[PDB]
Design a protein around this ligand. Structure first.
Ligand SMILES: [Mg+2]
Ligand SMILES: [Mg+2]
Ligand SMILES: [Mg+2]
Ligand SMILES: [Mg+2]
Ligand SMILES: [Mg+2]
Ligand SMILES: [Mg+2]
Ligand SMILES: [Zn+2]
Ligand SMILES: [Zn+2]
Lengths: 217, 25, 81, 96, 206, 97, 87, 120, 150, 129
RNA sequence: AGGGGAUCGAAGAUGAUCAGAUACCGUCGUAGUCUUAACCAUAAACUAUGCCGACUAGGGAUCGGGUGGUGUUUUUCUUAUGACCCACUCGGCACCUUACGAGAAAUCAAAGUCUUUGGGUUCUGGGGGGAGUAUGGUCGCAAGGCUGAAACUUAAAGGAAUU
């Protein structure tokens, strides 16, 4: 079973968008889950941690399960889903879905000089969530992922080979750390390099081209 | 215990100590 | 906001804004060239005073100094600059 | 700019400030004052020999309950009466 | 780029003046507003008529870009415009949301009233603000009828206008509809006010 | 933290103000952490007015009202006066209707 | 950007906003593509061909966006008189 | 305490949406219609639904109600509209202001003017 | 932002963009110079002289009209005071405050203000010493200050 | 006290860029500021800019490209010794690759690359990445 | 150390209340509360926000000054003034919205312009107790203040929110 709500979903089903790069170009909302699955079949999805989370009542307590889910490949798209449901497997599934919806690109770059294929980041760039500042820093070839476990896993999922990290603040709250890392990754595609002064065309969106095939009959 | 009260008691103790010292002298 | 082609604004904006905070600062104080009911002579008198200002030789008193702009002595005609 | 003169001929003030600040860090203070030699039973050494004066079962701290089979030991070098715990399954059958 | 016949024709200007579009606008101000040609003694600012008309034209030229007719969505909560909005919708393609907006409608792809627009037109950023805010989430430009007293938050092209009420709002709607029809539609000529009447709109039986 | 930005209020560019004494408690209280209510009561009661009108001399009579600015000190004003207590979102209100 | 001997890498080449040159980000759930129709005499609104802008989320969020759009219009000749250099 | 429940009301609404014709005002016929079209595992419930539908019908005679306007109720509002021939010319020729006149001076060609004053 | 209070004023005399003479405003330079010298002779102090010039006569700033300053002009003609004008005024103020204090034994605020005045004087004194206008190792305070005034 | 003027100049510029102003007004404006701006221009970070000859101190109006990200001036002017340069660039700039550390030298206010090429360095002023 | 000693009122009485109350409440009541000489230097001395400086976002208000109004209004003719009124404008005391920034959060136009870390400068802090103690200096007529430890000792003590 598939069945699309939203124009974009319909478009994807018709098979007129080839890869998510185009989607990213026009910053399109991807509220429908299946789209990412369709476009990226290469999705390696990892569970991080499932801390029980409590809520107090007149009798007993509510034990929900907050599960941090990463999603990725080696291409430079990463997901991060956080979900809090009562059933643990169900929660994990939901988290996966969320991560798939989220999935974001990375400007993988060069350590120093071009040589062959980018497996680092462009710029020393950081996030901060709650009070956890993950900085990441373009490490040179082969110098590996230099990160705390969670962050390291995230980097692996991304398809970064080489990264220094300065994770600061209370990184022991894993969720927050992960969020910060994700934010930092998102930021990559924001720092205007001089490789970016060059003027673009501004394409008419898939929404404004394949307009007739979109929307319900 | 109130901090003010504690301070007062400390002061009293100090005074007592001073008195003792004076006596010794 | 965002774009305000800075160097040349309207005269109105300049008039409104504090006469120190503009681009090229110029005083917005005049020289009243004042005539008295006595003699047929004009005196170059600053728009502000700080002094009770008598004429070229006559004890006529042109302007009484208030906080700012000088309030002229009852009925005296005056030019500008 | 916050505290510290981001100055350039500033340096003596910085250095002195650092010195003054350091004392609040415990380890450094201990090293400098020389707490190791004046106090803390051992002569700042790792190990010390002493003499089993009297075996005492010290009654343990809260949640936990038991008796803890320690020894009041008089050290040779300083002459200080400590209480040294003894590990494992009795072994006072060894201590005497 | 410019039709040059698309200057504000006298009849249209008269209409606008009658509506008091420009000659409303309360004495208060939002700092992002240079559509104001002088100010009146007591309680009134005056809106550069020509500029407003040009912006309306621009807005139409934006509604003319979207190929799907019922993809451009109009929205009004306040009563002084619901009827006008409906009329606009009838005239053009356009889906209308008159009255209670449905907070989260462009997000929440599960609602019984799921509209996904590519353009949204709004009466009041003071009342319908919720809709505008929602638009931010899913990326929709917001064409709106600004009273020069209301915020410009999340607004791409805003027709400067009066929103005291009555004949202004409705008139503006009518004008916009007319312009849209002119730019790809049935009504072909520059001149003639046509059967498209301004009073098809406005506020009727209260 | 601060329950209010203003606190017990009105001491802004004012150093340390003068103290007004309470009506009920006769506790001293600052003129800001004050709670002052203006009671413009009729010098008589509503059921006492009719009787007065029936018996009294002079053409109907204007009848005076008394004027008392009563300073109910903070605490005593929570023996139901002004004050009432409010929600975190209800406390951002500077109007009484 | 380019891997030594030509060969372009770095996909998803960011849209930049037309008003601010600030990069339109990947999850710019705030930004917009504005499309304005190239127009001709009697009816005629010329389908297919638009003068297009992108406005980044941030400016819009700030509020000052309408004026920026006006500015853009006045440059590409989609308006005259509406927005002036000096305010 | 005879407040009709959510469910009954919802059912009635649905019925009105899908079958606004064939709801002949009075109870008895309407009840039978409800029994026919809607599948109710009960009798009392069906009756209740019928009653609510009748009430709705009665209401919809005396105006439009919120959540109750579906195509055939729409066309009795959309077409039953449009006054028209009074316009915005009437009450002398073009009543304007001083500022308005000034504005006109800069932009438009030649327009009729009736200038007022406006003061404190 | 004000040498002694918490106040942060920006009332100030501005200046015109032109260093050149204001065209129509006639007279000469020599006449202006003469006027200045006359004023100096009469016992007025630089600022006062300038004020007198500006309002009654056709003067904007002597620098614009003559070329040289007021103070410089005074120095050239040898009529300038021994203790710089501002400093002298400060000293006078201090003296006044001291006198007041002599009378009123309990007037803490006045004393405090006097302290500030003294501090200001000291600053000024130092700077005069540096630029060599007060002969070095001359300190200006309480006992001798009064004598200095007049 | 407006102690350092370059700092002031950069701060306002930075603020403007953050908001999305296309233009800034810099109050005091020196030789040094102008030189810095010229350097920035040479590598295309700043647009046109106009120094008003105030018959006083100065005033600079800048045109922003939106190509600026952060322009920083470092607090004391650390004297910097040709190898120190590398360290500074590693710390202060977003890549071993692009952007510039704007150090004043005896040969003039250059960026860092230029200085390295020229083989001369001195005190640091700012940076532009 | 003098005066003045109305009111209130540490102490004390003294009545209740209470298992008990030299606590809360009632009634007296020195010291003190005024004040002149001196001292003492502390306070939740709080905006719990070091001082300078620059910049970024609007908004009305309000106090202080200052121009711009054929503006109203007082009439003793034209008035000239004041008091308003409208538009500004510096300076302040604050406040309301938004955050596009912060921040842990509460919140904040500053607590902003800080991992994209660098305007100038003081001072203070380093888990909690021990302890603002002990000792030593000192400055106090004393009460005390400024400075100010460690031994021990414990896995928390804290904040800000949520259920
Ligand atoms: Mg004050
Ligand atoms: Mg008793
Ligand atoms: Mg007692
Ligand atoms: Mg203290
Ligand atoms: Mg404090
Ligand atoms: Mg400690
Ligand atoms: Zn004269
Ligand atoms: Zn009370």
């Amino acid at each position: 079973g598939w069945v699309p709500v939203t124009k974009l979903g319909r478009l994807v089903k018709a098979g007129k968008i080839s890869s998510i790069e185009e989607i990213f170009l026009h910053s399109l909302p991807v509220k429908e889950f299946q789209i990412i699955d369709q476009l990226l079949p290469n999705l390696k999805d990892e569970v991080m941690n499932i801390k029980p989370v409590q809520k107090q009542t007149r009798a007993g307590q509510r034990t929900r399960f907050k599960a941090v889910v990463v999603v990725g490949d080696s291409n430079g798209h990463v997901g991060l889903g956080i979900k809090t449901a009562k059933e643990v497997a169900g929660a994990i599934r939901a988290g996966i879905i969320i991560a798939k919806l989220s999935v974001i690109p990375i400007r993988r770059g060069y350590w120093g000089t071009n040589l062959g294929q980018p497996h680092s980041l462009a710029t020393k760039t950081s996030g901060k969530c709650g009070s956890v500042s993950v900085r990441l820093i373009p490490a040179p070839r082969g110098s590996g992922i230099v990160a705390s476990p969670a962050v390291k896993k995230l980097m692996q999922l991304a398809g970064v080979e080489d990264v220094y990290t300065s994770s600061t603040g209370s990184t022991r709250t894993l969720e927050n750390t992960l969020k910060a890392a994700f934010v930092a990754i998102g930021n990559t595609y924001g720092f205007l390099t001089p490789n970016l002064w060059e003027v673009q065309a501004l394409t008419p969106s898939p929404m404004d081209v394949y307009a007739d095939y979109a929307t319900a009959s | 215990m109130r901090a003010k009260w504690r301070k007062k008691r400390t002061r009293r103790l100090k005074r007592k100590r001073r008195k003792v010292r004076a006596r010794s002298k | 906001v965002l774009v305000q082609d800075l160097l040349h604004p309207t005269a109105a904006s300049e008039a409104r804004k504090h006469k120190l905070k503009t681009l090229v600062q110029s005083p917005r104080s005049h020289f009243l060239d004042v005539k008295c009911p006595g003699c047929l002579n004009i005196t170059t008198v600053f728009s502000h005073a700080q002094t009770a200002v008598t004429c070229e030789s006559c004890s006529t008193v042109l302007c009484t100094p208030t906080g700012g702009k000088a309030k002229l002595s009852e009925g005296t005609s005056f030019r500008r600059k | 700019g916050k505290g510290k003169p981001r100055g350039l001929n500033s340096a003596r003030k910085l250095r002195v400030h650092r010195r003054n600040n350091r004392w609040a860090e415990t380890t450094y203070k201990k090293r400098l004052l020389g707490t190791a030699f004046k106090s803390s039973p051992f002569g700042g050494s790792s190990h010390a020999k002493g003499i089993v004066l009297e075996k005492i079962g010290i009654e343990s701290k809260q949640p936990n309950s038991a008796i803890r089979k320690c020894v009041r030991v008089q050290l040779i070098k300083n002459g200080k009466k400590v209480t040294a715990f003894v590990p494992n399954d009795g072994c006072l059958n060894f201590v005497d | 780029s410019l039709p040059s016949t698309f200057d504000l024709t006298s009849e249209d200007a008269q209409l606008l003046l009658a509506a008091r579009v420009h000659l409303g606008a309360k004495n208060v101000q939002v700092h992002q507003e240079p559509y104001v040609y002088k100010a009146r003694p007591d309680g009134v600012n005056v809106i550069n008529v020509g500029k407003t008309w040009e912006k309306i034209v621009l807005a139409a030229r934006i509604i003319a870009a979207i190929p799907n007719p019922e993809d451009v969505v109009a929205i009004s909560s306040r009563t002084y415009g619901q009827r006008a909005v409906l009329k606009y919708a009838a005239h053009t393609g356009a889906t209308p949301i008159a009255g209670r907006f449905t907070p989260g409608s462009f997000t929440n792809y599960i609602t019984r009233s799921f509209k996904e627009p590519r353009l949204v037109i709004v009466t009041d950023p003071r009342s319908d603000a919720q809709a505008i805010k929602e638009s931010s989430y899913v990326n929709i430009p917001v064409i709106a009828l600004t009273d020069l007293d209301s915020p410009s938050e999340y607004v791409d092209v805003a027709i400067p206008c009066n929103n005291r009420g009555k004949h202004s709002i409705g008139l503006i709607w009518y004008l916009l509809a007319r312009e849209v029809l002119r730019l790809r539609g049935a009504l072909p000529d520059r001149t003639q006010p046509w059967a498209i009447m301004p009073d098809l709109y406005f506020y009727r039986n209260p | 933290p601060k329950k209010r930005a203003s606190n017990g209020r009105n001491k802004k560019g004012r150093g340390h103000v003068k103290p007004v004494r309470c009506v009920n408690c006769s506790r001293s209280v600052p003129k800001d952490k004050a709670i002052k209510r203006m009671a413009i009561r009729n010098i008589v009661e509503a059921a006492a007015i009719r009787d007065l009108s029936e018996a009294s001399v002079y053409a109907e009579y204007a009848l005076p009202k008394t004027y008392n600015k009563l300073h109910y000190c903070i605490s005593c004003a929570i023996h139901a006066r002004i004050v009432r207590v409010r929600s975190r979102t209800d406390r951002r209100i500077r109007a009484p209707p | 950007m380019e891997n030594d001997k030509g060969q372009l890498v770095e996909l998803y080449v960011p849209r930049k906003c037309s008003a601010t040159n600030r990069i339109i980000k990947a999850k710019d759930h705030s930004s917009v593509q504005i499309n304005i129709a190239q127009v001709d005499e009697e009816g005629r609104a010329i389908p297919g061909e638009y003068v297009t802008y992108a406005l980044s989320g941030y400016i819009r969020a700030r509020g000052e966006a309408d004026d920026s759009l006006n500015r853009l219009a006045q440059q590409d000749g989609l308006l005259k008189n509406v927005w002036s250099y000096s305010r | 305490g005879r407040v009709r429940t959510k469910t009954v009301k919802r059912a009635s609404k649905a019925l009105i949406e899908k079958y606004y014709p064939k709801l002949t005002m009075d109870f008895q016929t309407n009840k039978r219609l409800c029994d026919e079209i809607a599948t109710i595992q009960s009798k009392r419930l069906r009756n209740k639904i019928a009653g609510y539908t009748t009430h709705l019908m009665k209401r919809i005679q005396k105006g439009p109600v919120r959540g109750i306007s579906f195509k055939l109720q729409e066309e009795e509002r959309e077409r039953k509209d449009q006054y028209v021939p009074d316009v915005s010319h009437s009450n002398d020729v073009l009543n304007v202001d001083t500022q308005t006149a000034e504005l006109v001076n800069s932009l438009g060609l030649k327009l009729p003017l009736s200038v007022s004053s406006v003061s404190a | 932002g004000r040498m002694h209070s918490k106040g942060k004023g920006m009332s100030s005399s501005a200046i015109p963009y032109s260093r050149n003479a204001p065209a129509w405003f006639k007279g000469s330079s020599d006449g202006v110079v003469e006027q200045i010298i006359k004023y100096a002779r009469k016992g007025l102090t630089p600022s006062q002289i300038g004020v007198l010039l500006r309002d009654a006569h056709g003067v904007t700033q002597a620098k614009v009209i003559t070329g040289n300053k007021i103070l410089r002009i005074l120095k050239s003609n040898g009529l300038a005071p021994e203790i710089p004008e501002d400093l002298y005024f400060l000293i006078k103020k201090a003296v006044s405050v001291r006198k007041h204090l002599e009378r009123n034994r309990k007037d803490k605020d006045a004393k405090f203000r006097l302290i500030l005045i003294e501090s200001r004087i000291h600053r000024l004194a130092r700077y005069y010493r540096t630029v060599s206008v007060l002969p070095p190792n001359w300190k200006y305070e309480s006992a001798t200050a009064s004598a200095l005034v007049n | 006290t407006r102690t350092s003027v370059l700092a002031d100049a950069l701060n306002a510029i930075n603020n403007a860029e953050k908001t999305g102003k296309r233009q800034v007004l810099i109050r005091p404006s020196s030789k040094v500021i102008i030189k810095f701006l010229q350097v920035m221009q040479k590598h295309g970070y700043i647009g046109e800019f106009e120094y008003i000859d105030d018959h006083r101190s100065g005033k600079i109006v800048v045109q922003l490209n939106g190509r600026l990200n952060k322009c920083g001036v470092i607090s004391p002017r650390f004297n910097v010794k040709i190898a120190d340069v590398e360290k500074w660039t590693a710390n202060l700039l977003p890549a071993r690759q692009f952007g510039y550390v704007i150090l004043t030298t005896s040969a003039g206010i250059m960026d860092h690359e230029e200085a390295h090429r020229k083989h001369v360095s001195g005190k640091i002023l700012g940076f532009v990445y």
